Amino acid sequence: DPVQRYKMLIPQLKESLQTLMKVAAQNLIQNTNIDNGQKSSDGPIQRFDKCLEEFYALCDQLELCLRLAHECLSQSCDSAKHLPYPQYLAVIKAQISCAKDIHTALLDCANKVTG
Amino acid sequence: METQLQSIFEEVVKTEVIEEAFPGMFMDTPEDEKTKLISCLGAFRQFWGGLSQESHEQCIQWIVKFIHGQHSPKRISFLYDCLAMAVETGLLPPRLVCESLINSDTLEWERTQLWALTFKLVRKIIGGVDYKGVRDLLKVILEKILTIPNTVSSAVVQQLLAAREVIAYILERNACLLPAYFAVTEIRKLYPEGKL
Amino acid sequence: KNKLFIKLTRLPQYYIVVEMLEVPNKPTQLSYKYYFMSVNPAMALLLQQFKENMCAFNKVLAHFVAMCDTNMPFVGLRLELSNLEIPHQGVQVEGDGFSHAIRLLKIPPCKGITEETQKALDRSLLDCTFRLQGRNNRTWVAELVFANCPLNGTSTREQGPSRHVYLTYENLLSEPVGGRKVVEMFLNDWNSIARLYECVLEFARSLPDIPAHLNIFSEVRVYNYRKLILCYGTTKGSSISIQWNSIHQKFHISLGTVGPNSGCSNCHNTILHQLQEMFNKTPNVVQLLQVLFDTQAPLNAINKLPTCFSILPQSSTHIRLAFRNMYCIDIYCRSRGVVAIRDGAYSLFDNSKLVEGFYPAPGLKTFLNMSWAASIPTILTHSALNILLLPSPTPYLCSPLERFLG
Amino acid sequence: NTASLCRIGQETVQDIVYRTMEIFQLLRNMQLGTYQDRLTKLQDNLRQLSVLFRKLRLVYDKCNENCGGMDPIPVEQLIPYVESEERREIAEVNKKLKQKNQQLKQIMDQLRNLIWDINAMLAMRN
Amino acid sequence: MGVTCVSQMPVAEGKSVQQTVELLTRKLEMLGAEKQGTFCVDCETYHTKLMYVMHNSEYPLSCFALFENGPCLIADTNFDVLMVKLKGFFQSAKASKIETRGTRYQYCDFLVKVGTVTMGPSARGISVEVEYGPCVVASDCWSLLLEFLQSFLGSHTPGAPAVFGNRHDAVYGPADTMVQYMELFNKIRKQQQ
Amino acid sequence: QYLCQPLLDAVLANIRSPVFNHSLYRTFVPAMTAIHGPPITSIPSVLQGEVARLDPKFLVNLDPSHCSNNGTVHLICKLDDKDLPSVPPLELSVPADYPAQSPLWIDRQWQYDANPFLQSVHRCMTSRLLQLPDKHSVTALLNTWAQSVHQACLSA
Amino acid sequence: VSVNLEAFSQAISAIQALRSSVSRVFDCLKDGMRNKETLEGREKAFIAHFQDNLHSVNRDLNELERLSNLVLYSQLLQAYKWSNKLQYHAGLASGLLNQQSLKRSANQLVLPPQYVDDVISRIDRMFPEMSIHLSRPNGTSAMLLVTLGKVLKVIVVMRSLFIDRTIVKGYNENVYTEDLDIWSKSNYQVFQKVTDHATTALLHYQLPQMPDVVVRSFMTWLRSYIKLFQAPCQRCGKFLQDGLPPTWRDFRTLEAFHDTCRQ
Amino acid sequence: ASRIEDPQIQAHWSNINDVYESSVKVLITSQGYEQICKSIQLQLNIGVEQIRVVHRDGRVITLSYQEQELQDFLLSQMSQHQVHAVQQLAKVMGWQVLSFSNHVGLGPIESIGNASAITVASPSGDYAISVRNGPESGSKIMVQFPRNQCKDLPKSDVLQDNKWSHLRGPFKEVQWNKMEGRNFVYKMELLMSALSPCLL
Amino acid sequence: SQDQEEIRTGVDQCIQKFLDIARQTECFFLQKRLQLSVQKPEQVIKEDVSELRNELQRKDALVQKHLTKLRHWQQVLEDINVQ
Ligand SMILES: [Zn+2]
């Protein structure tokens, strides 16, 4: 699903870049002509601003999908790294808490000795 | 043939690479100026006596472009001492050397040490030219002096003034290098009436 | 025919030839002649005699061998310096007797650096002495000594106007000691030093006129001519580092936390790429200090959210937050301590929903925390942002904002 | 007296960095009985480290407050360039230690000879 | 057992059989190689299938009997005496004996032996063997033998041998060297011309 | 090339138009500033260094006797060491643009004659200058002068 | 898997690069041409910068397409993150601080044989290619026979949990297998040079107090001699100098070198 | 060990020997700085007729039964350990090494062993030290005082600025005799502390 | 307090600063020692006296332990060798 979505958006991102480049070229040519001798048709034109925001929207959607997948994969690998299941989670949280007590003790002592 | 003269004159003034590491430990005084000049003059004498009359001048243009292509002034003055003894011993006609020295397009006034040493050598070897050659040399020296600006640097002025002693030597009436009428004719052809 | 070939293992292609000859008057003595040979089916290139001023050590032999092994590596460096049009003095005996050094006079000025900065650098480079050290005698060190340092640091670097930087280079095992890569890397480091001197000169010129908040907010700490470690924060905890990477030809900033009061990070690690690009487009450090001072306070609040909430880093001062995937909100930081929040999924143009969609219904919660009218922004104080984002118990320790979206 | 207190201050500042290094190594080896031992070791290290701070501080105060009469000469004016009963006690101790070192050298020579002889015999017996 | 390679190097041009060895051996001496004695490899044949019995001088007491693709027996010299005693019972063949006799040159842990398979009374050909005593592992010490050969052999350097065969951690054996020698000998006997 | 080309074509059309920026500016100002927001928040030095980094044996100074303060720098330095102080001046004319036109020593044979030791030092130092590589430096001339004096001390 | 994690992290940067590169193309165009002191220079500078910006957009887009192919409860995650952070921080700190030690003096053996046996067994557990045979023919001083493939047969001579003498021998050679041939030579010059280099490594790897990391590093450096006869010198690219395979492996850098090529 | 006492000498004979072999472990430290001065160590192999030396830098030397060879070799090794001590001390006191040469070739032609060479700079710029020890002529140390500090150097009119008055200049020599401490390393750190910043 | 590059640069900075200031305190102590030794050549002599006495005591204790071990092994060997 996260890999699948990344695949789905990539063709769209290429399409959005193509339109944004083409629309920019049409707008610049019309603006130069208006200034220049050439008088160009009013036409549909299509606004450059609308395309540039669309490209940014697709970029955010892709980054959000990848960031979630990376966070989910990192959490899974860490979970694997660390008889009944309730006692299992109990001893894990107990180890986690005793490590935190050691942390707090070292911190408070090293901060009370000086500074 | 120019490859032959290339090998000769390049083998004259080669520089040692491995010296200045273990400095002066190599057992050999590098030929001082006199022995090096005698060997150079001998080898060039071999190539010159081998050489034909019609080929007498293109080699001299190569010699002067090789001297003017140098950068070290000691190297330039050594090869100019070689050319001076090559003229003095009678090996070289003392008109081709002077003409190819001055008409060399590397001789510009910005090359001030080259300017000074060149016009010093022409002051040395101009006394043997016939008078028509002295007239043409006077013309080309005046045209060389004419390219200097109205203002130049205050340090280069004395080395620039070395052409003035050649001019003072040619236009000197007691030395009698040429009839003075020829001298004023070349001058007034170059500075007509009303020109400073 | 009675000779010994002592090859130099450190610098190859160089062979010492020691020949022995019978002395006529003494039938029980020998004479030694030493020559310096070189090789390119081995082909010799040049040959030169060298023989001028318990008894089995032959002191002069070991002396000549050590002299050759110490001197010959400098010849290749001299040739490489001459081949790249770098004016350098010849190999000279240093003042402490025993040594070899190649003191450079002028460096090729630069590429891509302004003329006035080139002049300021060329009038401050006092010496560029190169020296050889290290086992096997293949490490080079260049000691650059600059004068008139623009700005000092908190460390003990406020001494006399002479800053000494040592640049070390160790070529690979192959590619012998005298090569092109050493001087190439040296020129690359010089170019990076110049491109950094640009920014240090700009900062030194802008130091007299400061908006008077960045002066207490930020302080310079070290200046090693290849790195700029500025330090900012209320307690001077956070630190930013400026450096020019010649490999990518772009400025590389590195952020850290050095101070006995801070969070778990520099708190600016979520905007590192946009700050990289920002400094790459316009190389000015005062703008960096200003944007850091403006964006630190909202970042301290937006970093403590539960990680549900997802932080999408958009362009600078435009950090995006998204509860789950359905909801979104835009954070527009501005000067004078104000943040404008937006509806998020809403579009700044024709009223259509984005790919995420799911228009956030309430909207007016942001108004009380002071139809489609969530799309227009709503400014705050950074203190109302602290209240809106720091987890308070409920009027589990959740935020106000996540209670709203929940 | 003061010249030995300065050496004490030197050894304290040379040992504090080693203590911090040992503390870093202990925090590194602490992966998640043995936890109690690691904790009490870290606490003892911290206590001895604070004691070392106090010792170096007090010796600093001592060497700073001493400032004996013979210090008018600033540094760099002391390096020599080109251009009683204490000595008797030193000589006596030197003679004593020389005699003891000669005797200890004789003992070491005898021990080395013994070991070499035993090794040679036990090697040749095979 | 140290990885070894044997190849035949053609005399070429009008160089006599002996003239080429003289030159190749001098080229080996020009590697700083020092002579370490002499080596004789004498082999006899039987038309029984086909039997081969070969004995390198490097091995003082062993006699090797190889049965083509079949197993090689490394046996004591009394093996030759048993063979002679059986002789009336055994097959004999007709003057197929082949011998390579040449100098041994040692170059820092590599022994190179260049010899002329003299058939009967008339020399024809040349066998080069390079052995590496330190290299117990084989089939991947090929890079070594190849580099050393390109150093001195140059052209006509062999692109391995099949005695290495399938890639394996199997140690090289004196039997393998003997199989190389047998293939080389079959080639001299039949190269002809 | 791919996917960008018309933009490339467009700007390659419209260079050397004087109004050019206006047009770019106009069509690109609002959207960007809407999306990204508001904008942003005597003697040459090489000779001086070469002098500063000499060996304390030399005591180089300027030359006000002949050309002074003009550009190329004439120098009378010294020889002060355990060696010999024969003829300390060795007048050296360093031309402008130092990393070229290697400086030349103005010869003075009037003082180096009359004594054999001075003639020997002159001969050996001249030969050493002949063997010196092209584009030599001032330190090179000073060092070869010193080593030539030393050779005259030992060879004689 | 870890390879997937890296591909996702690389991709996240590539999306950021594409967005930044597209913004750069438009942002630079808005500023337009700059004076540049010359007509030719200004035209060239604008074209060069625009083309570099356009190319960067293409390169960044291509990477994203290519990268597609490759790929009470919260307190627990907080504890996991802090554990990883402390591990990395303490590792870096211990490395940086033991690399530069200010200790200058010590003044301000007996060891259990079973402990040495346990240490040797732990070291033999790793490096499956190496096989170490413990034996004590003469006293508590242990003698280790270490077989490395079909390549080496090293004879380490422990006096304590300390390395004293090493004599490597060939695989085909005989260590005599019995009362151990401590004093002998390999009869091959390559293995003699390897013995010299092993004694050099022993003299190099000398930790003052801890007697285990020294043996660990010695065994790790010996294991590098498994690509012998099968590696090229990293200085001359040659396999044979004077009929010797490369004999030196740099400490801190398990690379091959002929000892004449120091390295 | 009895005659030469300045640097150090140590020897740890092996436990098990043979009838045709033995081994020692020579170490050359300093008196006070044992930790940092651990750069030169030897492992002699006393054969039946030859003594084999394996240095820590990967150098194998086959000596003779002749005592003079071994004595000269050990003297040269002590001379080299002397400069390695200064190197390891500069590494610890934070002094920046400027140059280090194990076998220098500039100077007087030396005895049985080749001379060593080191040059370090003070952490705070200006000051610097240089050391040259050899088997015959050794302990040649000279400090590099900064300019405008000796006040005896002849000034020049070409120097028209005060920026050039900060470089390390006159190269003054120091007498190693009539000094404090009891070891080359003791005297070297006392000299380093003397050229340190006065934090008294 | 209450990815890899951040901790990397942070430990670099703090460790290098700690090392510099430690080497500076060592330099100060060495300067004080040099001054006290050069200008008060009597406390250093007392230090040498104390060090030599401690060395002599340590040597005596070591030789005592060696003699105890030697006597033990002498008795052990005298016990054996018998029949
Ligand atoms: Zn190699």
Chains D and G touch (3+ CB pairs under 8 A): yes
Complete edge-to-edge strand list for the sheet that includes strand C139-146: C102-104, C125-133, C139-146, C163-170
Q: Does I18 touch chain D (CB under 8 A)?
A: yes
Which residue of chain G comes nearest to I23, CA vs CA? G102
Determine contact, residues C343/C363, Cβ cutoff 8 Å. Answer: yes
**b/e code B57-94 from CB counts within 10 Å (16+ = b):** eebbebbbebbbebebbbbbbbbbbbbbebbeeeebeb
From the list C135, C173, C315, which residue is nearest G234 (CB)? C173
3-state SS, one letter per residue, for H67-83: HHHHHHHHHHHHHHHHH
Task: Give the SS3 label for residue E193.
Answer: coil
Strand E51-56, strand E34-46: pairing: antiparallel
Query: Hey, which residues does E113 pair with through a beta bridge?
Result: E104, E129
Q: Does A92 touch chain D (CB under 8 A)?
A: no
Q: Do D120 and H19 touch (CB under 8 A)?
A: yes
Task: Give the SS3 label for residue C291.
Answer: helix
D positions 3-32 inside 8 Å of G (CB): 11, 14-15, 17-18, 20-21, 24-25, 27-28, 30-32
Separation of C12 CA from ligand 1 center, angstroms?
11
Separation of G259 CA from ligand 1 center, angstroms?
7
- Closest Cα to residue G261, out of E106, E149, C172? C172
Q: Do C123 and F45 touch (CB under 8 A)?
A: yes
Which residue of chain D comes nearest to H146, CA vs CA? D76
Separation of G236 CA from ligand 1 center, angstroms?
4
From the list B17, B20, B25, which residue is nearest C52 (CB)? B25
Separation of G13 CA from ligand 1 center, angstroms?
42
Residue H82 in tokens: 């002397």
Angle subtended by helix axes F138-155 and F45-52, to nearest 10: 40
Helices and strands counted in chain G (H then E):
6, 6
* Long-range contacts, G32-37 (Cβ 8 Å, 24+): G32/F20, G32/F21, G32/F24, G32/F25, G33/F20, G33/F21
Q: Do G61 and A69 touch (CB under 8 A)?
A: no
Residue B106 in tokens: 């590397």
Residue D15 to residues G38, G208, H29, I49, I50, Cα–Cα distance (Å): 66, 16, 20, 25, 22
Which residue of chain G comes nearest to I17, CA vs CA? G97
Residue G210 to residues D28, G30, G221, G240, Cα–Cα distance (Å): 17, 66, 18, 39
- Closest Cα to residue H123, out of I24, D97, C30, I51? I24
> Which residues from F are below 8 Å from B24, CB to CB?
147, 151
Q: Do E151 and G240 touch (CB under 8 A)?
A: yes
End-to-end CA distance of chain D: 61
Q: Do F50 and C126 touch (CB under 8 A)?
A: no
User: Which amino acid type is present at position E74?
Assistant: I
Q: Do F47 and H154 touch (CB under 8 A)?
A: no
Find the length of chain E: 193
Determine contact, residues C18/C34, Cβ cutoff 8 Å. Answer: yes
From the list I10, I17, I20, which residue is nearest C257 (CB)? I10
Q: Does C314 touch chain A (CB under 8 A)?
A: yes
- Chain I interface, mutation test: which of G6, G89, G101, most I Cβ atoms within 10 Å? G89
Residue appearing with tokens 């082909």: C43
- Chain F interface, mutation test: which of H158, H160, H161, H167, most F Cβ atoms within 10 Å? H158
Q: Does G30 touch chain F (CB under 8 A)?
A: yes
3-state SS, one letter per residue, for B162-186: HHHHHHHHHCCCCCCCCCHHHHHHH
Query: Hey, which residues does C339 pair with through a beta bridge?
Result: C333
- Closest Cα to residue D62, out of D7, D6, D13? D6
Task: Give the SS3 label for residue E80.
Answer: helix
Query: Hey, which residues does G169 pair with through a beta bridge?
Result: G153
Determine contact, residues B60/B91, Cβ cutoff 8 Å. Answer: no
End-to-end CA distance of chain G: 38
Say how far apart CA G36 and CA G49 lie, in whole Å. Answer: 13
Determine contact, residues C149/C223, Cβ cutoff 8 Å. Answer: yes
From the list C51, C78, C90, which residue is nearest B27 (CB)? C51
Alpha helices (H) along C35-129: 59-83, 115-122
Experimental method: cryo-EM
Cβ neighbour number for residue F120 with a 10 Å cutoff:
19
Separation of C3 CA from ligand 1 center, angstroms?
25
Residue G44 in tokens: 């060239």
Determine contact, residues E71/E178, Cβ cutoff 8 Å. Answer: no
Q: Which helix (H) or strand (E) holds E114?
A: strand E110-119
From the list D32, D38, D50, which residue is nearest A113 (CB)? D50
From the list D81, D116, D124, which residue is nearest H173 (CB)? D81
> Which residues from F are below 8 Å from G47, CB to CB?
12, 15
- Closest Cα to residue B62, out of B4, B113, B133? B4
Say how far apart CA E110 and CA E127 lie, in whole Å. Answer: 16
Chains D and B touch (3+ CB pairs under 8 A): no
**Phi and psi (nearest 5°) for C222?**
-135, 155
Q: Does I47 touch chain D (CB under 8 A)?
A: yes
Cβ neighbour number for residue H164 with a 10 Å cutoff:
20
C105 DSSP assignment: S
Q: Do F53 and C335 touch (CB under 8 A)?
A: no
Say how far apart CA A56 and CA A61 lie, in whole Å. Answer: 9
Cβ neighbour number for residue C370 with a 10 Å cutoff:
9
Q: Does C58 touch chain H (CB under 8 A)?
A: no
Q: Do I33 and H196 touch (CB under 8 A)?
A: no
- Closest Cα to residue D45, out of A95, A109, A97? A109
Q: Do A52 and G83 touch (CB under 8 A)?
A: no
Q: Does C63 touch chain H (CB under 8 A)?
A: yes
Separation of E3 CA from ligand 1 center, angstroms?
22
Say how far apart CA H36 and CA G100 lie, in whole Å. Answer: 10
- Closest Cα to residue C77, out of C171, C168, C180? C180
Q: Do C90 and F49 touch (CB under 8 A)?
A: no
Q: Do C257 and I6 touch (CB under 8 A)?
A: yes
Find the length of chain I: 83
- Closest Cα to residue C363, out of C381, C341, C379? C341
Alpha helices (H) along chain G: 2-31, 39-70, 74-99, 113-125, 189-204, 213-223
Chains G and B touch (3+ CB pairs under 8 A): no
G76 DSSP assignment: H
Which chains, if any, share at least 3 CB pairs under 8 A with chain B? C, F
Find the length of chain G: 263
Residue F100 in tokens: 């070229």
Residue appearing with tokens 């097959």: E91
* Long-range contacts, F75-82 (Cβ 8 Å, 24+): F75/F138, F75/H158, F77/F142, F79/F145, F79/F146, F79/F149, F81/F57, F81/F146
Helices and strands counted in chain I (H then E):
2, 0
Q: Do B28 and C48 touch (CB under 8 A)?
A: yes
- Chain E interface, mutation test: which of G148, G153, G187, G188, most E Cβ atoms within 10 Å? G188
Q: Do D11 and G108 touch (CB under 8 A)?
A: yes
Measure C239 CA to nearest chain H CA, in Å.
25
> Which residues from G are below 8 Å from H39, CB to CB?
none
- Chain B interface, mutation test: which of F62, F94, F132, most B Cβ atoms within 10 Å? F132
